[PDB]
Amino acid sequence: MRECISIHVGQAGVQIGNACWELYCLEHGIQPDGQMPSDKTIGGGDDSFNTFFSETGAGKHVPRAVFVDLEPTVIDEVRTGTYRQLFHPEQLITGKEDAANNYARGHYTIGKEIIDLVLDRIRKLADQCTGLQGFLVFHSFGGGTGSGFTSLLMERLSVDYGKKSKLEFSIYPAPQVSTAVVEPYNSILTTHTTLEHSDCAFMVDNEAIYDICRRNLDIERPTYTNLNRLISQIVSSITASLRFDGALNVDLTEFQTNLVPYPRIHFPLATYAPVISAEKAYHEQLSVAEITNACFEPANQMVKCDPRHGKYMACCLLYRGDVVPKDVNAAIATIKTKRSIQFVDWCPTGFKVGINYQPPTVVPGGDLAKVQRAVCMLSNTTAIAEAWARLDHKFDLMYAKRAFVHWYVGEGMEEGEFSEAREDMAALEKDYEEVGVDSV
Amino acid sequence: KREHEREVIQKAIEENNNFIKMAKEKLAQKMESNKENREAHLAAMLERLQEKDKHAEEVRKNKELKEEA
Amino acid sequence: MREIVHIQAGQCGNQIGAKFWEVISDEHGIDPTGSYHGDSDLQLERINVYYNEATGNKYVPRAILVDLEPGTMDSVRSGPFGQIFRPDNFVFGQSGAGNNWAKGHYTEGAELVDSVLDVVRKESESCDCLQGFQLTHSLGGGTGSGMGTLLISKIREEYPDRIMNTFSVMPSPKVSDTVVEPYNATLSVHQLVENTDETYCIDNEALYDICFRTLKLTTPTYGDLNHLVSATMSGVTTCLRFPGQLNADLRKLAVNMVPFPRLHFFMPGFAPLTSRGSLTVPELTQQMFDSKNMMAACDPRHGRYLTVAAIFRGRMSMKEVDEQMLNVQNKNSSYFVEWIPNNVKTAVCDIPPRGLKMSATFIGNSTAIQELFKRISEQFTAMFRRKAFLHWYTGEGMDEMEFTEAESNMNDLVSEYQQYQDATAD
Ligand SMILES: Nc1nc2c(ncn2[C@@H]2O[C@H](COP(=O)(O)OP(=O)(O)OP(=O)(O)O)[C@@H](O)[C@H]2O)c(=O)[nH]1
Ligand SMILES: Nc1nc2c(ncn2[C@@H]2O[C@H](COP(=O)(O)OP(=O)(O)OP(=O)(O)O)[C@@H](O)[C@H]2O)c(=O)[nH]1
Ligand SMILES: COc1cc2c(c(OC)c1OC)-c1ccc(OC)c(=O)cc1[C@@H](NC(C)=O)CC2
Ligand SMILES: [Ca+2]
Ligand SMILES: [Ca+2]
Ligand SMILES: [Ca+2]
Ligand SMILES: [Mg+2]
Ligand SMILES: [Mg+2]
Ligand SMILES: [Mg+2]
């Protein structure tokens, strides 16, 4: 059945999951109560949208999702919200006390109380799957739950599910968008703890989406809702191949094999085009070749960095909507002629492509205008190391003076785990330099 | 060739098998060392409450011995 | 879900604590009888944090009122909100402490401390998830200081994983002529450095100077001084009492405000501070960082900020707030430690305080706070060099060594503040 189980951890992951499953329902015609009139396969079926939704005998399409947060405020809104009966009570897990921006509390202290319960609920969803393909894990780097509990969950999932695919969607912190002083520590600790358990991680620099929303959509002062709705477009493009039937779509295994050249180098740079308001979309259409070119403009990346100063190692271009192969092949042909777009010399063939003819969908309320052709590019570029460097520097400034470290030691951690995690990051930075060097 | 085709799958199984145990064991000690560390950080607070209470009683004794007029 | 347990000891602690309840009950639409008479549903979304739900749609402060002199117990009952308080939570002695720290900490307060813990234990048992305690007290008296610090240790002993917050008032010659106040303050600071996670320094010298110089009050009273305290206390607790995009508790505040465990003595500030006989966002921002608006008699431009938290109140342009905090930060870049990136966070709340369209509350962990402790250490050493009035504390069972230990620890705290003030990124 090729099912995929989504796991949303912490405020960011939960709230990002709210925008994704809202979009999914709009793309599949699922009502807030879960009823799907267009589905005649009542109680089950082998349809492509069943990879993300399970069916009940009463015609209820239930997300294959688990929501976990160490405090109940955020998920409580889901329990009383407009999609309250879309999910099952067992799928919405909450504690009483949060991790307090502390990785250690999310991983060791408050996390342990709830981790065994979370695995059991994930287990319950797995047993309903005939051919579970992998896990999607949405979380922030900055929060204590998103960093500490996610790390705990990823380690436990590797034991209970072995090498089964685990993909992340990670929110890289930024001062613009409600960050905290200790978030660099949490980002480094969770990255190091998760490096060896994640097969492909999709970072989203919250500063980048803040800028895109503030520039492309003319939103003076973006909100989390504005950002999440934009993130959901990228998540939808990546999972469209799995939720819809099609002859030219990219499943997860196909997706990971063509984008990750080495196990540790698994942080693709996401872009989406077109991101445009209704006022600009009025009397204006963009073509396949136009949105393909926009994917290589650093101004549209989901993570702030300069691909022009780095090297590409693999590009995945997921087209959707009114897109024809002939235009796709011509647009990609142009990119290969551009000497401004340099591939490593060990990547002679570096484009994975796909098309999902289902048209892009807009939330009724979401600042994005409804377009007819959209493309999401995911490129493994060395430039992404710039994001690691920025975060590593902030880690060094605080850690040199051991600022805030006592909050982590008080919860049972040792300073050795800080330096070990930092050394792993140093190796990763050197790894990105090594893969970018020309061959002999 | 058949013999090789089968060494491959048996090795692939071993890959996944050892992945689970390097994860089960690493997570095992991280929770062990974290238990000890917070136990020590709480056993040290059982010694500060002990000394703080002991010093309070020494004070109340000194008052007592000073009332002897 | 995140309940705070309020305790207030001594005369000062009860007067400022009473005003705190007389200020936030109005903000939450609770009248003295404990009934809700508000308009916005946001007033109740976090009523739990400070109020217990009682039968009949009544709200009761989660407050514990203490003092060794029973007289002040009646003063609260006579207060504007006296009857809102749960009568069982009044725990009073019969003698008073006479500005003697040892009486409040070791002998007389010790005899009463256990009766208070029972009230503390009862309130804690009726909390869905106890998030911490907050204490309001003075450091120059005898009860709020000596017994207050004892209580902190005992509560920390029973609730080791709960956050301990205090609004500590320390003495100034301009407000109190009591002579042994430097002893009581120094002795209490020795406790607070060890047993509290975050302490707001409400300096009576800063409150006097603000009342006299800025508000033009030739004759300032405890009511004038307490008006600043209540405004500050309402501001620094705004994000605990009201919802928004922040969703933060006491532990998150401590985690991001305290880079080093001992350096948890904050430097409150409030804006605007204007005389009755006389505003834009950039003006709030400039005044908020002005020394004249600080509740601690310290000049931040004599040291460096380790961390800062600014809470803007009232309906205002969000983008205007973000732009001005950027403008103030880079125009004062030197006064922020370079080795803590992004150390100035801002929260914004739509609900303004009573009588103002906009308010700004400042919480700074600055190394300049050492100026305060140096002032007390100077006064302490003056009396301790000659053992002045030392027999007051020895008679209660104390040792002169404990005085030097409290002195040297506070002197060490000054050094540590100076250490990180001089620290460089590279
Ligand atoms: N894009 C996006 N980012 C978010 C959202 N909510 C929080 N963040 C980011 O997450 C970081 C804060 O961590 P959270 O995920 O909210 O904290 P948590 O996972 O709930 O863990 P706790 O520390 O226990 O609260 C900030 O740096 C934000 O940039 C959201 O809704 N959308
Ligand atoms: N800001 C402010 N300070 C006060 C107030 N009341 C007393 N103080 C200060 O508190 C100090 C004296 O401590 P008190 O609280 O009165 O003494 P106590 O805690 O009741 O302890 P004992 O008198 O020894 O029983 C003096 O330095 C006063 O300046 C007040 O209402 N507001
Ligand atoms: C009690 O409610 C508050 C709680 C907190 C903060 C705060 O000041 C804005 C509060 O208002 C009183 C806060 C403290 C400053 C920090 O850096 C110094 C930080 O990163 C952390 C912040 C807060 N986080 C954010 C993104 O603002 C969480 C802690
Ligand atoms: Ca179906
Ligand atoms: Ca059905
Ligand atoms: Ca006076
Ligand atoms: Mg949270
Ligand atoms: Mg295919
Ligand atoms: Mg008294």
Ends distance of chain C: 44 Å
Strand content of chain B: under 5%
Number of domains of chain B: 1
Largest sheet strand order of chain C = 5-4-1-6-7-8-9-12-10-11
Q: Tell me the CATH topology of chain B.
A: Methane Monooxygenase Hydroxylase, Chain G, domain 1
Shape of chain B: rod-shaped
Keyword list:
part of a larger assembly, 3 chains, B: 69 residues, mainly alpha, Methane Monooxygenase Hydroxylase, Chain G, domain 1, 0% strand, C: alpha/beta, Rossmann fold, 60s Ribosomal Protein L30, Chain: A, 3 domains, two-stranded antiparallel ribbon, 14 helices, 18% strand, binds guanosine-5'-triphosphate, binds calcium ion, binds magnesium ion, Stathmin-4 (chain B), metal ion binding (chain C)
Quick summary of this structure?
The structure is cut from a larger assembly and holds chains A (440 residues), B (69 residues) and C (426 residues). With 440 residues, chain A is of the alpha/beta class. Chain A has helices spanning 10-28, 73-80, 103-127, 144-161, 183-195, 206-215, 224-243, 252-257, 278-281, 288-294, 325-337, 385-400, 405-409, 415-436, and strands at residues 4-9, 53-55, 61-63, 65-69, 92-94, 134-140, 165-172, 200-205, 269-273, 312-321, 351-356, 373-381.
Q: If you had to describe this structure to a student in words, what would you say it looks like?
A:
Chain B: It comes from Rattus norvegicus (Rat). Chain B: Belongs to the stathmin family. Chain B: Exhibits microtubule-destabilizing activity. The structure is cut from a larger assembly and holds chains A (440 residues), B (69 residues) and C (426 residues). Chain A is α/β, with parallel strands linked by helices. Chain A has three domains: 1-268, Tubulin/FtsZ, GTPase domain (Rossmann fold); 269-383, 60s Ribosomal Protein L30, Chain: A (2-Layer Sandwich), CATH 3.30.1330; 384-440, Helix hairpin bin (Helix Hairpins). Helix content of chain A is 42%, strand content 16%. Chain A has 14 helices and twelve strands. In chain A, the strands form three sheets. In chain A, strands 5-4-1-6-7-8 form a six-stranded parallel β-sheet, with helices on both faces. A four-stranded mixed β-sheet of chain A has the order 9-12-10-11, with helices on both faces. A two-stranded antiparallel sheet of chain A has the order 2-3. In chain A, α11 links the parallel β10 and β11. Chain A starts with a strand and ends with a helix. With 69 residues, chain B is mainly alpha-helical. Chain B has a single domain (1-67), classed as Methane Monooxygenase Hydroxylase, Chain G, domain 1, CATH 6.10.280.30. Chain B is 94% helix and 0% strand. Chain B is built from one helix and no strands. Chain B has one helix spanning 2-66. Chain B starts with a helix and ends with a helix. By secondary structure, chain C is an alpha/beta fold. Chain C folds into three domains: 1-259, Tubulin/FtsZ, GTPase domain (Rossmann fold), CATH 3.40.50; 260-368, Tubulin/FtsZ, C-terminal domain (60s Ribosomal Protein L30, Chain: A, 2-Layer Sandwich); 369-423, Helix Hairpins. Chain C is built from 14 helices and twelve strands. In chain C, β4, α2 (71-77) and β5 form a beta-alpha-beta unit. The longest helix of chain C has 25 residues, at 101-125. Chain A binds chain B through residues 108-109, 112, 155-156, 158-159, 162-163, 197, 409-414, and chain B through 15-17, 19-20, 23-24, 26-27, 31, 33-35, 37-38, 41. The structure holds guanosine-5'-triphosphate (2 copies), ligand LOC, calcium ion (3 copies) and magnesium ion (3 copies). One calcium ion binds at residues 36, 39, 42, 55, 59 of chain A.
